[PDB]
Each structure stands twice: as structure tokens, then as C-alpha cells.
Amino acid sequence: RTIVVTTILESPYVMYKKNHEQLEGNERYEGYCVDLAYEIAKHVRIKYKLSIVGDGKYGARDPETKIWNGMVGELVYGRADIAVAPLTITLVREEVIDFSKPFMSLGISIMIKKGTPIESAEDLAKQTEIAYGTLDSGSTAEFFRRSKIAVYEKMWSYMKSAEPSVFTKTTADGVARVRKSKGKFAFLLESTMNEYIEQRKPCDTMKVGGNLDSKGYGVATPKGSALGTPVNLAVLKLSEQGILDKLKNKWWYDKGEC
Amino acid sequence: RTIVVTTILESPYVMYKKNHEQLEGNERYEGYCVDLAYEIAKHVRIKYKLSIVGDGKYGARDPETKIWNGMVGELVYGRADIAVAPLTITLVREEVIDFSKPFMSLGISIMIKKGTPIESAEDLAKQTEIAYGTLDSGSTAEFFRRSKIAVYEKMWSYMKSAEPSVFTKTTADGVARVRKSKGKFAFLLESTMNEYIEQRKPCDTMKVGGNLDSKGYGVATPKGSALGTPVNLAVLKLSEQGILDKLKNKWWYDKGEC
Ligand SMILES: C=C(C)[C@H]1CN[C@H](C(=O)O)[C@H]1CC(=O)O
Ligand SMILES: C=C(C)[C@H]1CN[C@H](C(=O)O)[C@H]1CC(=O)O
Numbered sequence: 001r002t003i004v005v006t007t008i009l010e011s012p013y014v015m016y017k018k019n020h021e022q023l024e025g026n027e028r029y030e031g032y033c034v035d036l037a038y039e040i041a042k043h044v045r046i047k048y049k050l051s052i053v054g055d056g057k058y059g060a061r062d063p064e065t066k067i068w069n070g071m072v073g074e075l076v077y078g079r080a081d082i083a084v085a086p087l088t089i090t091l092v093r094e095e096v097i098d099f100s101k102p103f104m105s106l107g108i109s110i111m112i113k114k115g116t117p118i119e120s121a122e123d124l125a126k127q128t129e130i131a132y133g134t135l136d137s138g139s140t141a142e143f144f145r146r147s148k149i150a151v152y153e154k155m156w157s158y159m160k161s162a163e164p165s166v167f168t169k170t171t172a173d174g175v176a177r178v179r180k181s182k183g184k185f186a187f188l189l190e191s192t193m194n195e196y197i198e199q200r201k202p203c204d205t206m207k208v209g210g211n212l213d214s215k216g217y218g219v220a221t222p223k224g225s226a227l228g229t230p231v232n233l234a235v236l237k238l239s240e241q242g243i244l245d246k247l248k249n250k251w252w253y254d255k256g257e258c
Numbered sequence: 259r260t261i262v263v264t265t266i267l268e269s270p271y272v273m274y275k276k277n278h279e280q281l282e283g284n285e286r287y288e289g290y291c292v293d294l295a296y297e298i299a300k301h302v303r304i305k306y307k308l309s310i311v312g313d314g315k316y317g318a319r320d321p322e323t324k325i326w327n328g329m330v331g332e333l334v335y336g337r338a339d340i341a342v343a344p345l346t347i348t349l350v351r352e353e354v355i356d357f358s359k360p361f362m363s364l365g366i367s368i369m370i371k372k373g374t375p376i377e378s379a380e381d382l383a384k385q386t387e388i389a390y391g392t393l394d395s396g397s398t399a400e401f402f403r404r405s406k407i408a409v410y411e412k413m414w415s416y417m418k419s420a421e422p423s424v425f426t427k428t429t430a431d432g433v434a435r436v437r438k439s440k441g442k443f444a445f446l447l448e449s450t451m452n453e454y455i456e457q458r459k460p461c462d463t464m465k466v467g468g469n470l471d472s473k474g475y476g477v478a479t480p481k482g483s484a485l486g487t488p489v490n491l492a493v494l495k496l497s498e499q500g501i502l503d504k505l506k507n508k509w510w511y512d513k514g515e516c
């Protein structure tokens with residue numbers, strides 16, 4: 001009856017409101033994905049409750065246990081009805097859950113500290129003075145792991161052997177490390193996050209080059225679900241009324257501090 | 259057994275090869291969508307035959323007869339198995355057919371003759387010296403028709419009353435009219451086509467501003483079809499192996515004459 005929407009803390013998708021400790025239920029949270037979930041639930045006509053996923057992950061299958069973790073896992077095992085999050089639409093995920101058409105478009109991109117002499121992945125690849133890394137798990141790591149393009153294989157071989165580790169746990173962590181490494185560390189992250197951070201004080205980062213790939217985030221539901229179709233048409237309607245553009249502007253640029 | 263793939267002539271998606279009159283079947287054609295269809299059919303393991311849609315349309319429902327026309331129509335009425343074309347993923351279409359995840363990302367955009375004093379839709383909207391129009395039917399017309407954003411309503415009201423008609427039949431026609439109007443006509447078209455034309459001689463056009471929206475083209479199949487799922491995973495695989503990027507580069511930029 002009250003449907004379970006699994007989500008995850010990630011700025012500016014889902015964040016605690018300033019006085020969250022005095023608040024209850026969905027009121028604790030705000031952000032792009034909270035507003036999206038509200039809009040979708042209005043069109044599909046459902047009451048829902050946002051739940052932060054317990055294990056803090058997006059969704060991968062353990063090669064040993066074959067268990068899906070994260071939000072994908074909550075859907076696969078029947079413990080959530082919908083996931084609304086910056087969940088990258090990937091083939092291994094699409095094989096076990098259903099994604100809506102993308103609510104957001106993006107690509108893997110490069111974050112540098114202002115003044116770093118790097119404009120492209122090719123600049124990074126041909127050197128070692130400036131270190132570079134992805135998140136430890138997620139779709140970006142996986143892009144590099146699986147790539148068969150020369151530049152990207154190089155980069156992956158470099159990252160997978162670099163001492164000490166170039167990979168980081170969270171967006172915050174990768175960003176802190178760009179900001180503290182005096183130009184000697186670039187972070188490979190999705191363009192959406194990169195763009196957001198660039199408009200945040202201290203305004204010492206920038207996105208450089210084009211993106212390395214082209215993909216989307218999708219709202220996810222379990223296979224066979226009766227919410228699949230209405231959720232999909234809901235994303236398209238919202239896209240077509242301009243509401244997805246409006247919410248991106250709201251959370252990325254209306255408040256931009258740079 | 260040999261599955262019917264409906265398509266349409268549109269450069270550089272599907273074009274006649276130089277010696278097409280001496281050739282037979284799928285060999286008559288080349289382009290981005292011909293290569294896509296080949297790649298998809300390889301992964302899904304199907305033999306197929308490309309058919310140019312008889313009525314030369316993409317897909318709309320007549321408000322009087324309720325008949326779907328064009329490629330969408332061929333799928334809806336059972337006369338084609340798959341459509342592979344620059345078919346924009348729209349809600350009214352998604353309600354009657356199935357689209358794969360997008361194979362290409364894009365948006366409505368502005369084409370000007372080089373030297374026209376226009377950088378944005380806002381520049382166009384606030385004036386009449388420089389005329390502007392969309393194709394007569396398609397997703398772009400429909401964007402403007404349905405928009406509730408102020409700038410775009412203005413533009414739509416202007417276009418729907420302008421004398422003589424600002425709307426044109428085909429991409430070629432809109433382009434010819436940009437090129438012959440001495441800077442007094444701008445064409446609103448999808449960014450993909452705009453980008454292609456900009457790399458074609460006489461190199462007298464350019465794309466200006468950002469896009470007005472964000473959407474994709476999808477491969478389409480009839481609702482309930484056994485090819486739906488494999489086609490969808492096939493697009494994602496191809497996206498993930500870099501083949502969609504490779505084909506775009508091939509048809510848009512490898513040969514670019516500007
Ligand atoms: C925030 C992180 C862990 C997520 C967000 N989208 C990707 C995902 O859906 O896997 C991850 C980012 C990345 O891999 O660069
Ligand atoms: C080539 C034309 C008629 C097609 C291509 N995509 C759009 C469609 O799928 O409707 C149309 C373009 C447009 O509306 O600007």
C-alpha cells in the first residue's frame with residue numbers, strides 16, 4: 001500500500017535537510033531525487049516512503065555468492081518497490097531489474113584542481129606526475145576495467161597498480177583529494193557530480209575535456225512489477241513538461257556559489 | 259524468419275550507396291542506422307531485411323481516424339518487426355510501441371547561416387526580422403505546440419501564424435532555406451542533424467546555443483514482442499563496447515568536410 005522507495009545519500013540528489021533530526025519520514029530529506037520521487041508518485045498516484053539503503057551501495061553482484069547488493073539488491077529480493085537515485089543504466093543491471101528511460105544524461109569526466117596542466121584523458125594517460133583514480137566500485141571503475149580502447153586500457157593498468165591507492169570510497173573523498181593534492185591528483189567521476197562540485201565553494205575545481213562516454217540514470221523497479229510501465233511514462237511526461245530540466249537547474253545552478 | 263526492419267532515408271542514418279541501382283536488398287543502403295541494424299542483428303542472431311517505410315513518415319496518430327502512420331504504424335499493425343531510424347523517444351510513441359534505451363542523445367537546436375546575429379532561442383523570440391520554423395510534423399513541432407515555457411509559447415505563436423509558411427517538409431528543405439535566405443531564416447532541428455550539416459560543404463551553417471531539450475532516439479519494436487528484450491540489451495552492450503560512439507564518429511566527423 002505505502003510503497004517502499006529505496007534511495008541513498010548523495011549530494012544534491014538526496015541530502016538531509018538542515019533540521020532533519022527534528023523531522024520525520026520523507027520530510028527528513030531533500031534534493032533532486034526527492035523532488036523526482038514526489039513528482040513521479042503524483043503521476044502514478046501512490047503513497048510512498050523513502051528508505052536509505054542499509055549497505056550504502058548502488059548495485060553489483062558478488063562473483064562468489066551471486067548476491068546482488070545495494071539498491072539493485074533491494075529490488076531484486078523484493079524489499080523495495082522502486083529505486084530513485086543516480087543509478088547508472090548499465091547492461092548487467094538491466095538484465096536483472098527494469099529501468100525507466102533516462103531522467104538524466106551524462107558521462108564519465110575529469111575533475112582537476114584549477115591550474116592543473118590537463119585537458120583530456122590522453123593528457124592523463126601519457127604521464128604519472130599527476131595521479132588519477134575512480135571510485136573503488138561503481139560504473140566508472142567498470143568502464144575502465146572492461147574497456148578495449150587503447151587510452152583507457154593504459155589508464156586502467158596504471159590505476160590498478162598505482163601505489164598508494166588512487167581509488168576512493170566516496171565522491172566527497174575523491175573531491176577532498178583533488179583539493180588537497182596541490183594539482184597532483186585528478187578524479188574520474190560522472191559529469192553530473194563534477195558539474196555540481198564546480199559550483200560549490202571554494203570554487204577550486206573544474207571539469208575538463210569532453211566526456212568519455214554517454215549514458216543515463218534511470219529509475220529502477222523489479223522485473224514484472226505493475227509499477228514499471230507507469231513509472232516509465234511518468235519519467236517521459238516529466239521530461240516532456242520540462243520538469244527534469246527545471247529540477248536540474250534548481251539543484252545544480254540556481255544556488256551555484258561560483 | 260527473415261525479420262522486417264523498417265527504416266527511412268535520412269542522411270547520414272540511411273542513404274542510398276553510390277551504385278545502389280546496380281545492387282540488391284540491404285546492399286542498397288549505408289549509414290549509421292544500417293551499421294546499427296547490422297550490429298544489433300549480429301548480437302540478437304537474426305537475419306533481416308531493411309524496408310524503407312512506404313509513406314515516408316516517422317510516427318503520429320491521426321486525431322480523426324486514430325490510425326498510426328509511418329514506422330510506428332508499421333510496428334503497431336504488425337507489418338514490421340523492428341524500426342531502426344532517428345526515431346525520437348516520446349511519450350505518445352512509448353504508449354503504443356517499445357523503445358530500447360537510447361542509442362543516441364540529443365536535443366532541439368538552432369541552425370543559422372554563418373553571420374546571423376543570433377546566439378539563443380531568446381534572441382529569436384524577441385524579433386521578426388529573422389524568420390524561423392520547424393519541420394511541419396515531428397517531435398520538434400510537437401515540443402513547441404505543447405510547451406508551457408514562456409519563450410517557447412511566443413515562438414510557437416509566431417511560427418503558427420507567420421506568412422508565408424516557416425515550416426518545411428524535410429531536413430534538406432529547411433537547410434536549403436537557411437542557406438538561401440541570406441541570414442533571414444533560422445531552422446529549429448534536432449542537434450544530431452544540425453551537427454552533421456555543419457560538417458558538410460559549403461560549410462556555411464552553424465549550430466548556435468545550447469539545446470532546448472534533452473532526449474534520445476530509440477530502436478522500436480511492437481508491444482509484446484520477443485525481440486524487445488534482446489534488442490534493448492543489444493543497444494546497451496553496443497553502447498558499453500564503444501560501438502555507438504565509433505559509428506557516430508564515422509558518419510558525422512571522420513568524413514567531415516569543414
Ligand atoms: C555515487 C556512486 C557510487 C555511483 C553514482 N552512479 C554510479 C553507479 O550507478 O554505479 C556511481 C558513480 C561512479 O561509478 O563513478
Ligand atoms: C527526420 C524527422 C522527420 C524526424 C527525425 N526525428 C524526429 C521524429 O522522430 O519525429 C523528426 C525531426 C523533428 O521533429 O525535428
Ligand SMILES: [Zn+2]
Nearest residue numbers: 016018020021
Ligand atoms: Zn545532521
Ligand SMILES: [Zn+2]
Nearest residue numbers: 274276278279
Ligand atoms: Zn540513385
